[PDB]
Design a protein around this ligand. Structure first.
Ligand SMILES: Nc1nc2[nH]cnc2c(=O)[nH]1
Ligand SMILES: Nc1nc2[nH]cnc2c(=O)[nH]1
Lengths: 186, 188
């Protein structure tokens, strides 16, 4: 279900520190800051490999799994895309995703366990589609947003592409839309 | 390694699920699985891959991945022993539960699933291929005694790669005859 893009106060202006409960989670699990924002850790990378044809044959692990957490101090996952589709599974909290297709269409939906209100707890972002995400205030998980992501073939930086500023965003969605989504781009 | 201490509704399931879970089941179209529990395949990758499988082996085509929601309830609190050639990624979403893994070696491992990682619980777990796995519901008022997870199989799930255990008979041959008596409620 479509969702209005109405970033909360701490999303537009990140807080210097996250609630102690989330900091503890970060420390105990040894999560590290992701280049696109948020905290993460690869917890699984298949022992099995596969060969795939890539536009310029390469080898990749069959799959990779990560924990990905957004917090009040790092509430945004900046726009980026992967050649491969990515499976997302909600575990704790609430968040919102914004997708920008190559043709320019923008889609946004909310993630949470209240499906009766349009929220989803499983979602796949097709390869080639730019995605960004931001934290939604929620009391159930101390204003945090924890999910698991699985990519097949397994993650490789060579298949990753981050969006470059509002300039590149402008080419895709136009000036007005680019301005509205600027807070989600590098 | 948690101890196998089944709740009352596990050894003797309730006739029907509680209203909150029945509503979830109906809204999501979850169907009772043969091995027990309710499930639904929500994604099967349109992309494929060729993999070698023993039969002497031969090449077969598989979808790159499959995803399902899997739910245990008081009326169906057990996910009976079954195995797959492929490893399976499990992601906890709601509730609590416990797994029992029987490796081909005969080794038995058991652990609890939940978000209290401070108490040994885990919210992500990968079961290697060839390992028989079973799960049972753990009481928890948080999710009205439900246990919801997501499972991702890579390569994607295919019946040709699936194997369910047949009663204590085969179970007894894998683990001690005495152990088969303790895990008997998770098989057949
Ligand atoms: N799996 C994985 N490893 C990474 N290392 C750096 N960035 C990433 C990422 O997005 N995924
Ligand atoms: N992924 C998946 N799809 C199925 N289709 C029928 N049964 C199953 C099953 O157990 N898993």
């Amino acid at each position: 279900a479509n969702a209005a893009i109405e970033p909360a106060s701490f999303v537009k202006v990140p807080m210097p520190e996250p609630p102690s409960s989330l900091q503890q989670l970060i420390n105990d699990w040894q999560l590290i800051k992701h280049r696109e924002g948020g905290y993460f850790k690869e917890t699984d990378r298949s022992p099995y490999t596969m060969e795939v044809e890539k536009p310029v044959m390469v080898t990749r692990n069959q799959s990779t799994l990560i924990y990905y957490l957004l917090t009040p101090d790092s509430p945004i996952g900046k726009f980026h895309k992967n050649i491969n589709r990515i499976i997302h599974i909600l575990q704790r909290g609430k968040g919102q995703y914004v997708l920008v297709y190559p043709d320019g269409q923008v889609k946004s939906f909310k993630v949470g366990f209240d499906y009766k209100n349009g929220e989803v707890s499983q979602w796949v972002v097709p390869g080639g589609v730019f995605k960004a995400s931001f934290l939604l205030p929620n009391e159930e998980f101390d204003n945090g947003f924890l999910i698991s992501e699985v990519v097949v073939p397994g993650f490789d930086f060579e298949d990753h592409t981050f969006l470059k500023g509002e300039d590149e965003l402008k080419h895709l969605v136009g000036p007005e839309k680019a301005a509205e989504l600027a807070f989600l781009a590098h």
